[PDB]
Amino acid sequence: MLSHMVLTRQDIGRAASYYASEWQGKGAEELGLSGEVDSKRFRELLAGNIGEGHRIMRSATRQDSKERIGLDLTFSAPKSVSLQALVAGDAEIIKAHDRAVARTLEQAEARAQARQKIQGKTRIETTGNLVIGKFRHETSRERDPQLHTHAVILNMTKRSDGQWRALKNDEIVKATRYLGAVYNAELAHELQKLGYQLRYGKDGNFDLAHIDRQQIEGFSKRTEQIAEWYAARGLDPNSVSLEQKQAAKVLSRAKKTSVDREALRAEWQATAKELGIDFS
DNA sequence: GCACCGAAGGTGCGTATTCTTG
């Protein structure tokens, strides 16, 4: 799955609460950002502070409006893949998943644009450079093994005149449906090369064959809570509405109890084999 | 494309929609 969200001022904390971590992009490499992410410098980049002796971006933003600090492209991996990576503990699947993200974001990067006004007439220009902060997370709200990566695309791209202008967001936003598959297709290719058998269902989606549905929803409690949400309120999973579909975006909440993780994975392991799950 | 940002021109706005649920 590719979950997206355009990021504003209201979110800057939760945006920083995203710290395993890597930079990616032509926009990042030109600003000299390589290797892991620095929390102080990432928040500087969210806020508009590029540094390197240049002004602060998005000065020409209107004040009635929300200052959007970037775009969150979350690459959420299927359940069966999370279990073989987090419960079995396979680094190869962790490493396969990062590549699906990285190769998908390169196509997102190819779709980067910004606007240039020359004598009162705006021009759209495809820049093809992005400044992305990627953060690999391993759990979910109900702390089910849930591999997902936050691709924070910073609201900046360098133009051909050498300037840092805000990214034109459109052709990335309206390509989320495509990029969700590009992540599907890359990850499927990688697992297929590791010797893993895949079973298919719904949209191009797939699970490992040794992990059937029988033991998937056991680890999909967060989905059981979503499924029970609409079922309480007398409504189908499939015949929902856009926003009304996010009626579970929160309200299926739990307590974010900070827990030890070593004893959790042994819980995973025992909750796995209790479903007879064979990691083969 | 507009209407307000701010110092020239540049900007959010809106866009989005799988399931495993950010």
Numbering used by the authors: 1 to 19, 33 to 293
What does the primary publication say about this deposited structure?
Relaxases are DNA strand transferases responsible for the initial and final stages of DNA processing during bacterial conjugation, a mechanism of DNA transfer between bacterial cells. TrwC is the relaxase of the prototype plasmid R388. It is a relaxase of the MOBF family, presently composed by 114 members and including relaxase TraI of plasmid F. TrwC presents two domains: relaxase and helicase. The relaxase domain is responsible for DNA recognition; it shows extremely high specificity towards its cognate nic-site.
Deeper analysis of the ssDNA region of the nic-site focused on the U-shaped turn located close to the catalytic site, which is conserved in the nic-site of the related plasmid F. We solved the X-ray structure of a TrwC nucleoprotein complex containing a nic-site mutant efficiently processed by TrwC that carries a different combination of nucleotides in the U-shaped turn. Nic-site mutants III, IV and V, are still efficiently transferred although they present 3–4 mutations around the cleavage site, affecting the nucleotides involved in the U-shaped structure. Moreover, although all previous TrwC structures were obtained with selenomethionine derivatives of TrwCR, we were able to obtain native crystals with TrwCR-mutant IV. The main difference revealed by the new structure was the formation of a different U-shaped structure, in which the formation of three hydrogen bonds between G22C and T25G in TrwCR-IV stabilize the U-turn shape DNA structure. In the IV mutant, both Lys262 and Ser89 interact now with G25 and Lys262 with T24. These protein–DNA interactions together with maintenance of the T23 interactions with the protein and the Watson–Crick base pairing between C22 and G25 allows the formation of the U-shape structure in TrwCR-IV. In the three dimensional (3D) structure of the TrwCR–MIV complex, there is an obvious new interaction, a triple hydrogen bond between C22 and G25 that makes the structure resemble in size and charge distribution of the U-shaped turn of the wt complex. In all MOBF structures, T23 is extruded from the extended ssDNA by its tight binding to the relaxase. The mutant IV containing scDNA is slightly less prone to in vitro relaxation by TrwC than the scDNA containing the wt nic-site, although TrwC can still relax mutant IV scDNA. TrwC is able to cleave a mutant IV-containing oligonucleotide RIV(25 + 18).
